[PDB]
Amino acid sequence: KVFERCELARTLKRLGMDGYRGISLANWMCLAKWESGYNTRATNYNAGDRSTDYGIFQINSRYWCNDGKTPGAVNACHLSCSALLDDNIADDVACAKRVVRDPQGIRAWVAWRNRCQNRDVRQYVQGCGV
Ligand SMILES: [Ca+2]
Incomplete structure (x- = not known):
């Protein structure tokens, strides 16, 4: 499923x-x-x-x-990768939370550093009422 911006914002909150x-x-x-x-x-x-x-x-x-x-893989979220491809992001979120609980946090995703760090990111939630 493809979320609309504000619909996802309200879901995550x-x-x-x-x-x-x-x-x-x-x-x-x-x-x-x-x-x-x-x-x-x-x-x-x-x-x-x-x-x-x-x-x-x-x-x-x-x-x-x-x-x-995946060779030499671990499953820290105790989930089938399968679960991350359906339309319910409740487990995705529980897993994302688990990722950031590691030393590195959100920096674990290089795209964040490239695209989000030290940027004005208000754009992503403006008008969503969150
Ligand atoms: Ca899911």
Whole structure:
């Protein structure tokens, strides 16, 4: 499913992402935007390391979910990568929260540093009533 901007913003707020481990809602919106374009079915194969990025947050199969075909992989979220491709982002969110609980936090996603860090990210939540 492809979310509309404000519809996702309101969903994330309900799911408790605003201020999670110090990360503002606008940051999470910025990340979802550059990672998947707000598409829950998004998938990216990394030919280079044989891992795949899944879902709205492009969660990588080497560490966070199990797809069975990633060598030397762990499944820190205790989820099938499969679960990150449906239309319900409740587990995606629970997993994203798990990612940022690691030392690195949101920096774990290079697109955040490239596209969101030290930027005015208000654009992503303006007018959404969140
Ligand atoms: Ca899901």
